[PDB]
Amino acid sequence: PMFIVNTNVPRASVPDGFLSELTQQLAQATGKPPQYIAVHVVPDQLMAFGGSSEPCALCSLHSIGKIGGAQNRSYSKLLCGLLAERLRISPDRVYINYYDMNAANVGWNNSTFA
């Protein structure tokens, strides 16, 4: 797994430690090893949510398995929680798209996972 957050929150409001905290929490939540987790934060974006430019986020979580109805609900709680606490973004201004990737459709180290 890989997690991307795009946000209008400015770069200086992103705590040092944030990427490393995302990595560790995602390891716990997904059961995958932290050494294979990727995280990407994109601040200072030009975006609106409901026509307003108060803090908001558009995110994604890609995983080879560990995606489904109950799991995505816990991920959303965890992730919205982190975004609320660390970036001061309200949970109702965050979308997270979940993608269950086939191992054949993930490239890594000159090959794929299948």
Place this chain on the structure above:
Amino acid sequence: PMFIVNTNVPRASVPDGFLSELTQQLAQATGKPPQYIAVHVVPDQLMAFGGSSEPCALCSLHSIGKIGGAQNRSYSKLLCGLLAERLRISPDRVYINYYDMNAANVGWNNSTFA
């Protein structure tokens, strides 16, 4: 629904009001309430279309339903007409990837939509 555009056009060519205009036009086109529509514009990108770096765009529209053959063609006409009129990007240098998201694979407000 959420709409993202990445483009090589500079930020200063993005008119003021463009995010509001996208929000209102997508609200009408999708039928979804405006307060839930998210829009994201990413100018000044390093990109090329057909090997040429004249103005271009790579876009996404995600929605829980309201995605399909005829509807997608209609969204493309709407959206390419906005990009052409507002950012001066020729419609034949724009791609829009459409994603019909399962409600269970969209996180929002600490949970999902299923």
Place this chain on the structure above:
Amino acid sequence: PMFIVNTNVPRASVPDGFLSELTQQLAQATGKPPQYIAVHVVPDQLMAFGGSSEPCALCSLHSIGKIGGAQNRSYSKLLCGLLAERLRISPDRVYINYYDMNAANVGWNNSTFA
């Protein structure tokens, strides 16, 4: 096709010619006409792979067909090799997500391809 690379490598490390080379090499690999191929490179990103901020990349390749077990392995070797050679990113710090798009879900030139 369309290929997007996101990376923490700095902008000044992306060689002139890189987008053309990607274009040409993707034409060769996918067999599609160069004029349809879109490429997009986003340097200087805040990102981590395995908790480390050594050079890394998160990529996508979208195509209408020409995605599959063996083809994806071949694309990963090609694109990781370019990333290693031109941006100095180790292949084991690159993820590439592959998307086989339905023609109906690709907008272009006021319409879609289905």
